[PDB]
Amino acid sequence: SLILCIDVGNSHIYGGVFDGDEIKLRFRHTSKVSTSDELGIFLKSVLRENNCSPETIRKIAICSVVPQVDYSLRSACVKYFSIDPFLLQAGVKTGLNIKYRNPVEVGADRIANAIAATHSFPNQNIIVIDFGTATTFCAISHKKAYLGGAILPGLRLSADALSKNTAKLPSVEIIKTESVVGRSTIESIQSGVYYGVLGACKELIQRIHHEAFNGDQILILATGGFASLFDKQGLYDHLVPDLVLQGIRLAAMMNT
Amino acid sequence: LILCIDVGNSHIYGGVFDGDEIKLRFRHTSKVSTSDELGIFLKSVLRENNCSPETIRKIAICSVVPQVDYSLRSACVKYFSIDPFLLQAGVKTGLNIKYRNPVEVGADRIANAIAATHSFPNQNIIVIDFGTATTFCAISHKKAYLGGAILPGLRLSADALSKNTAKLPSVEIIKTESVVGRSTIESIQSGVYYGVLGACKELIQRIHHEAFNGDQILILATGGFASLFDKQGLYDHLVPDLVLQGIRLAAMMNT
Amino acid sequence: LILCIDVGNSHIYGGVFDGDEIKLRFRHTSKVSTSDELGIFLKSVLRENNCSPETIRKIAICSVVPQVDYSLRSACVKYFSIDPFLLQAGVKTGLNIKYRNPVEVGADRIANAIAATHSFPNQNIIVIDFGTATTFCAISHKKAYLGGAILPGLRLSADALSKNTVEIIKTESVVGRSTIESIQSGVYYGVLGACKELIQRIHHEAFNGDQILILATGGFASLFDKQGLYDHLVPDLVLQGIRLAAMMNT
Amino acid sequence: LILCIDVGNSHIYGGVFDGDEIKLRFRHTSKVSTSDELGIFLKSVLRENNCSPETIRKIAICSVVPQVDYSLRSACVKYFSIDPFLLQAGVKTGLNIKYRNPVEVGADRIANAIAATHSFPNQNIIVIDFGTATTFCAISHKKAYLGGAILPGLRLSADALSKNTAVEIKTESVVGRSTIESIQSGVYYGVLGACKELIQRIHHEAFNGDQILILATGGFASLFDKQGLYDHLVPDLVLQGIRLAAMMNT
Amino acid sequence: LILCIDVGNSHIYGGVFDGDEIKLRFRHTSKVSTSDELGIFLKSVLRENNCSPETIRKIAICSVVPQVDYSLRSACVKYFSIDPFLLQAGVKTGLNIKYRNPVEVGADRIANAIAATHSFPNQNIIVIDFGTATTFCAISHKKAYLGGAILPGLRLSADALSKNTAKLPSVEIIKTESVVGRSTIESIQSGVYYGVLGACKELIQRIHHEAFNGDQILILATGGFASLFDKQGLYDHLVPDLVLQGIRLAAMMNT
Amino acid sequence: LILCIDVGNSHIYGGVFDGDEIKLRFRHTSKVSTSDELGIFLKSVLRENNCSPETIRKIAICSVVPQVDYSLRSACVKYFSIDPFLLQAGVKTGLNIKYRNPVEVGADRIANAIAATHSFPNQNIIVIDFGTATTFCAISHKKAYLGGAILPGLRLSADALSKNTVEIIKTESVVGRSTIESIQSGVYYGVLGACKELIQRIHHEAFNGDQILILATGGFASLFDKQGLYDHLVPDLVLQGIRLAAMMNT
To answer: Measured between alpha carbons, how far is D239 from E124 in angstroms, rounded to an integer?
Structure first.
């Protein structure tokens, strides 16, 4: 009765074994081109080497936004674990009213956020912010209706696209900046992308607050890798770093 | 008549002046590569817009892509018989740069400050450029370039989301009206419009409190994507040819 | 004189009509170009071919690549003072689109369907384009684009083999005694039979076995004139139907 | 117990035999790797599938990607203490390679031909390999490898279209009413008739109307188990022929 | 007036000969162009450089990039009304190729050999082309093309160190005086100048003592990086236009 | 027992010392990798080569790729619980770096210098590292790192030729009668002469006539043993000098 959850994202393949409610172990793999044996050898070794026998995993649930790793992870599960995994796909039970034109366009990771956000915080209007590969914003009503949202590039994708498409301009590690007026080009990208997403969040919060929720009170939820660089500030109420893996389990239980 | 040429990372942007006013403007790719190639284009771009190539007796070049420099300079001497003005490190700009290394400041950021502190001589200036990158530059009233910030532009943001994120398509940049996107196409448009809008709002007010700490300022916007933020009250002035103006003023300072 | 421009994936194909007939034709690569780059090519390519650019009174554009569409429009207004006809969403095509989403159909597929039905009026038509892709389109006698199929082209298929592991000639052998011969025997006989499998399976799915006409167009269309696969080779079909779409929208 | 490895352009395909029958098969990606990575993977992929690494007494390798060969050979002396049989130009194959330069024929095409003529001995055979590329090999009843044709794969064809324009691999619909629908109406029925043409042309150019037999190997072979394209579906044809080639040379 | 075209991997290189001497030279970026893009440039680059396109009577094409060949040949028949001479398999070269596959030799190495052994008619020659790749060719006094060797060019040897490395810049190719560089920039320059200098020295006298056994030879050198080794007594003659000379010579041989 | 890890531009080269001698060396490709991907690999490579990961109590890391840095650090503190020694800016080395900025000397050049001055204590040393870059290093007998030269390596040189227009062999003749033989005969005798020039120029410049000891290391070093080029071939020179710098510190 140890479940396993996987988020196949663009930056990483992200896993976490839940013993009921609390995560005993989390792991990471690169989302590359891999076979069901390569992924099968990995999933067993990554469990075993961290005080956790592979033969104890009773259920697997899968969430993905990369279709090219989909067949090979499903096939890895049916070979190395004897589990046909739960696929977070359209249209299983979610408990949510998708307000998109095409409900299939909403990625399963944003759905998993919205499932966990409305479980952990049941009766409030929610903005969820993922500071991951992208910087996604999503509005959800208190009646569990996924309204939609906005998608920006991440802090890595902001600082790397500058170095990629411009000559004589380097790449930089993301840290918190104190001053907005850089006396180096290196300090201009630091001030620019830090205080740029810091104002992008503030603006997207208030535009959505008044437009999606007509002025009603909200709960702001943060998740993702670059989330803890903004706890000083504005900006959001709860930092829930496992909001994706929580809701994969929570979608697997809706479909058991 | 002077030909002013800006070499950016996506566009070579040129333009001709008849003393003070601009007769003609043109664009090119920062790609095409030989002196023969550039020299055919420069001569045919002037001729098809009713402006004989032989009338050009002055050329001035600001550039930020060094791989275009050699053959563009070489395109000028072969086809026009003009050794162009190079907006470089060591040439007479009428300003002190407050960088730790004043060679690290690009030629376009200098040229925008030159033209800004010429047009509005005794005011603190925040110049925003909306191009390949969205740049914020802080210049004080005594012609001092203090540095500033750089963001990825509107086009570089959207194209980062279509390349590094699978199952996400490339989008058009419009003045978006719905902040809550009902499609993947609409979510990215709302993101690259209200994301930069608040990034402008934040960076402008933070610079105002740090470099100037509450003093009087004048906001100047330039760039290709600058037209989309007219309605807001985000900038005081919109100067579409601010880079091409400052190449002319720096050539004037060094002629 | 009317200048018709067809934006493809590989080449921006262009022609200029002296009323009914094409006087001169030219080709440009589909790439990154500004309005000044496009207009300089456009004004020059006429002028070097004994055609003053000022004789051109009409411009009509069919496009499949959106990243060329703004600067190509803006080239015509600056260098010719002509606002071009854009075969796009909403314009008078004069036919019945049977797709799920009618705007998902390419502008090249509409222009081909318009022209073929004009020259051959009361007939059911399969139009094969042998271009960047090899496309098959079922159009009925009642001016109804029922749909069809899209294979990879001869160039794309031969290039994808070399990419992840050649000159397209009329092969006489299937048993290649070299690795160069085996790829050439591959794309020839494997599309000659792809056509037979497409031409005949559509023949019953779209016309239930009725009397049809098979038109072929493109650059790789010539290499199948021996086998008796299609009836007519019309190389300028796309350009005819940009002119025709401009005529209905005059 | 023999470990047989096929090194292809997209995959390393391996299998362990207990004599004639197969008890385990596996797959790795063909990338730049080291002898240590490959030797960890190999020892791991065996043990976790209940075949203990120490039971392997022979290793036999056939390869078509020369840059994977050195580290995979070295992985066997370091981690298994076996210098593997290499299916290289010059070893005993038992077949007359009628190519102009017989070294051109890949080890994969040779391995399939050895296995095809061992299992179905005195017969003319078309072996089709639905892999990276769709290959058609002609082999006579006299065990002469005559040559053949190479079409790009079904994956390469579905990817070439999307890559060079501004889908997942049975299609019942020939007339497409979507772009994602016309692409698989094109792909499925295009290679279906490609094979149909290639088969009967090889059947008449190489075998002049004689009784042939058709074998199909590869991961995309099962998509044509309905249409009566081939006689036999042998999915491990490449691995049987490595095992047979080792046997001839040991 | 004869027009000689070379198609290298970096550039399309042209030069119009007034009989024996080159009136004008030019350059086009070797990209997949069309039959019409190429035809515009050729008639424009001549016209802007005081040489009318009609005065050209013949054309001669050397090629190593086959993808540029179809449309450049088409650019001549359509726009110039001239069917170009093509230097390839079949035509008169006046050489005996000692390659295992005589087709595998590039047309430009064939071009170079024809000019070298015309300028220096009874000698053993090692020709070194310091271009994109630094190639070496042994040619006997009997005009036997025996073959040779090919090294990465000085630009390749610099760009390989930076593009295939994290934390290493791309460097300028200068004549340095030290081999003990005390900066990263200096270390690559000292290696990329003195690594090639010794590579040339070894490839010269390995071929001298194996293809010519130890007899009288003459070392010619062509290319854009040839003049960096002019001091060191490496070669006998710097011939800048060795390719175009050899294209014109082969045109003459076959007309 | 101590693990020394050399992060290169192509390979991550590890080694386990039990006192003075290497018991096992291994190799991983320098890729985008996580702490979990690397930590699994590390614990797995040791065990498969008769060495339990629990017996390792010390880890040292020299690195030239700073993107490998963070995740390799994390894999040490998690999967091994050993916070690794980093040969970085500021650690004790016991040598005078005569660079204008001593920081810009790669951590891999410091490791080669340390080990050469340890093994051969009172001698002027050239060290040639035939790796990704073919590097040259002048170290005086008083242990002054005087600087040096950097060439592209044998792999990058050959691969630059085919990416802009082979497998690395010791060629017997300069006269290539093939394109393959021409790239083989330029790269072999080119680096042979490059060495001969960069050895003889450093000898006259950095020491200036006096006795020198030429040492060779790296993977492409093996091919030049015949030409009397270097004095000693120490293939583990980097790993020894990673160990020695950990011995000088912590």
So the answer is: 55
DSSP string for residues in B9-50: SSEEEEEEEETTEEEEEEEEETT---HHHHHHHHHHHHHTTT
DSSP secondary structure code for residue A67 in this structure: G
Domain span at residue F27?
A: 1-87
Q: Which two tokens stand for residue A133?
A: 């590969």
CA separation for the pair B136, A177 (Å, rounded): 16
What is the C-alpha separation between E190 and F135, in angstroms, rounded?
A: 11
User: CATH number, domain at E106?
Assistant: 3.30.420.40
Residue C97 in contact with partner chain D when CB distance is under 8 A:
no
- As a residue count, chain F comes to 250
Q: Could you tell me whether strands D124-130 and D133-139 are parallel, antiparallel, or unpaired per DSSP bridges? A: antiparallel
Return the closest-CA partner of residue D175 out of D184, D163, D166, D165. Answer: D184
Q: Are residues B236 and B152 in the same domain?
A: yes
Task: Tell me how far apart the alpha carbons of residues A106 and B245 are, in angstroms, rounded to a whole number.
Answer: 47
Please say whether the beta carbons of E128 and E208 come within 8 A.
no
Strand partners for B4? B15, B60
Beta carbons within 10 angstroms of residue A145's beta carbon? 16
- F113 with F149, same domain: the answer is yes
The DSSP secondary-structure symbol of F55 reads S
Residue type at F245 in one-letter notation? A
Report the number of distinct structural domains present in chain C.
2
Interface residue of C185, C188, C224 to substitute, partner D, most D CBs within 10 Å: C185
Which residues touch B140 (CB under 8 Å, ≥6 apart)?
B124, B146, B211, B212
Q: Are both D72 and D187 inside the same structural domain? A: no
Cα Rg, chain C, nearest whole Å = 19
E16 with E46: CB under 8 angstroms?
yes
Residue with tokens 């008044």: A210
Q: In chain E, how long is the greatest CA-to-CA distance?
A: 59
Residue of B nearest to C53 (CA): B48
What are the Cα distances from residue F169, in Å, to E111, F154, F172, F197, F232?
30, 10, 9, 21, 21
Q: Which of E41, E66, E87 is a domain's end point?
A: E87
Last residue of a domain, one of A88, A107, A139: A88
Between the CA of residue E147 and those of E129, E197, F154, F176, what are the distances in Å?
14, 21, 22, 5
**Contact assignment for B43 to E48 by CB distance below 8 Å:** yes
Instruction: Name the nearest CA neighbour of A191 among B148, B214, B137.
Output: B148
Q: How far is Cα B62 from Cα B251, in angstroms, rounded to an integer?
A: 10
Phi, psi torsion values for F246, nearest 5 degrees:
-75, -30
Report how many helices (DSSP H) and strands (DSSP E) chain C contains, helices first: 6, 11
Among E37, E39, E40, whose Cβ lies nearest the Cβ of C29? Answer: E37
Chain B: partners with 3+ C-beta pairs within 8 Å: A, C, E
Report the distance separating Cα C88 and Cα C245, nearest Å. 10
D170 in helix, strand or coil? coil
